[PDB]
Design a protein around this ligand. Sequence first.
Ligand code: NA
Lengths: 207, 205
Amino acid sequence: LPVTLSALDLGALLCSRICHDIISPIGAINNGLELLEEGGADEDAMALIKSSARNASARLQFARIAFGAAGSAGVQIDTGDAQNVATEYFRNEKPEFTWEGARVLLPKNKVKLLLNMLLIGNGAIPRGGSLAVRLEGSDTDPRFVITVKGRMLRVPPKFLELHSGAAPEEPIDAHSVQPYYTLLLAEEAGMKISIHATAEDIVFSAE
Amino acid sequence: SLPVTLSALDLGALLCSRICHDIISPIGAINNGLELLEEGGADEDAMALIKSSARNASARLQFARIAFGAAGVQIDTGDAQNVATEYFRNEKPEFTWEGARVLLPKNKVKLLLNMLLIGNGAIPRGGSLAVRLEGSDTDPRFVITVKGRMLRVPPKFLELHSGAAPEEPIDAHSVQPYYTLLLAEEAGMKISIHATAEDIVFSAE
Ligand code: NA
């Protein structure tokens, strides 16, 4: 709302964000190969390569739908696909992850909004906890509810800032592009995000 | 001018789909190799697959960081040379680079790297791809020369560059020639194509 990125700058920052998120697991694959060649712990090295490749794959498949155009011809996305890539993604994240709600075809940007709200939620519990998703409403008027609980509970400051309609203090970059993008998707989809924060939990909801 | 236009949301989505696709493939190959290694019977083959795919994934990641990502205002062509050289080590054509190392506006260097992908696309059975950097730092000129057994300007690039709208919408494949042209437009540079029976020269200035 208060700031806008050019097509070139949005695309570049989203690409940087995806790259940033896979540097470590792809690096660990290379580390595993180095350990394997050094010998003495071949099983550990292979296990590392396996889990790091699974991590990289999960992040790429999630990005394919949350940031990319995948799962769509376009126009619609199957929330069953969204549930699958989200569940595998959170296998490599701290919170205990649950998903509730009927499998449904929805406009692509509404499902992309949903997946991006998971990332905001994850950011709100940086010391872990639980992230629970509920799909509610109708297929014409969906409602997404993302509820997080954990020892550290805080609305991500950049998201709070942008969502309140305030221009950012520093330029949008590969970190802040994701909350910017989340709000952009909500605007595009004609949906409004609400934040309800208590001492027990934070609920991010959209409708 | 480009005969089609993408919204910020659609360009962002298609660029992300393209890099996801290009790095998913070798990561997927590692996973196939891991399944095969666990089965035994071709351990050497499975390990060679894992190793070659890890190098592909790393090379594509580092190239994407600069060619597609935002990695401030200027880019050092030395960094472009480094990621391009490693990328093409894992590709068919013989790759060479000539020209003074220079700091240039980021989109001009992104244009350069994206022109390499078009060049690579023009020689699908291999050959040589040669880069020359010319001109001044205010008026750079890029020259990409390809030679090979098969020479063909990638049809989607030819179509878009010639000003004809495509019969089908831009997708995760054709977004790359679209982006190449879009970068040239923002940078105020013009791409010319000189295709003969002997070689194809893509130049920008
Ligand atoms: Na995983």
